[PDB]
Amino acid sequence: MKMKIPLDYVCVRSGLLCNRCQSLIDSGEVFEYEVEIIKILLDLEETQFKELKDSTYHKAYKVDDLLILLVTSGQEMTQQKWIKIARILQEKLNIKVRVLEKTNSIKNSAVQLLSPARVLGVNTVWMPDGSVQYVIRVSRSERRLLPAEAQLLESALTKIHSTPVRIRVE
Ligand SMILES: [Zn+2]
**Is the domain covering 2-101 a CATH 2.60.40 domain?**
no
Tell whether residue 129 is among the known ligand binding residues.
no
How many C-beta neighbours within 10 Å does residue 11 have? 19
Same fold, 2-101 and 106-169: yes
CA distances from 74 to 28, 45, 61, 128, 160 (A): 27, 12, 21, 41, 20
Q: Looking at the domain 106-169, which fold is it? A: GMP Synthetase; Chain A, domain 3 (3.30.300)
11 among annotated binding-site residues: yes
- Domain ranges in the chain are 2-101, 106-169
First to last CA, the chain: 41
DSSP state letter for 97: E
Distance CA 103, CA 100 (A): 8
Side chain identity, residue 14: S
Residues with Cβ within 8 Å of residue 130, at least 6 apart in sequence: none
Find out whether 18 is annotated in a ligand binding site. yes
Q: How far is CA 26 from CA 69, 136, 151, in A?
A: 21, 36, 29
**Angle in degrees, CA 8, 13, 16, rounded to 5:** 75
The resolution in angstroms reads 1.7
Technique that determined the structure: X-ray
* 3 contact partners, CB below 8 Å, separation of at least 6: 38, 56, 57
Separation in Å, CA 20 to CA 1, 9, 42, 60: 19, 12, 19, 20
Cα(90) to centroid of ligand 1, in Å? 26
Residue 30's CB is within 10 A of a number of other CB atoms, namely: 22
Query: How many whole angstroms from 20 Cα to the centroid of ligand 1?
Result: 5
21 among annotated binding-site residues: yes
Answer for the pair 41, 31: CB distance below 8 angstroms, yes or no. no
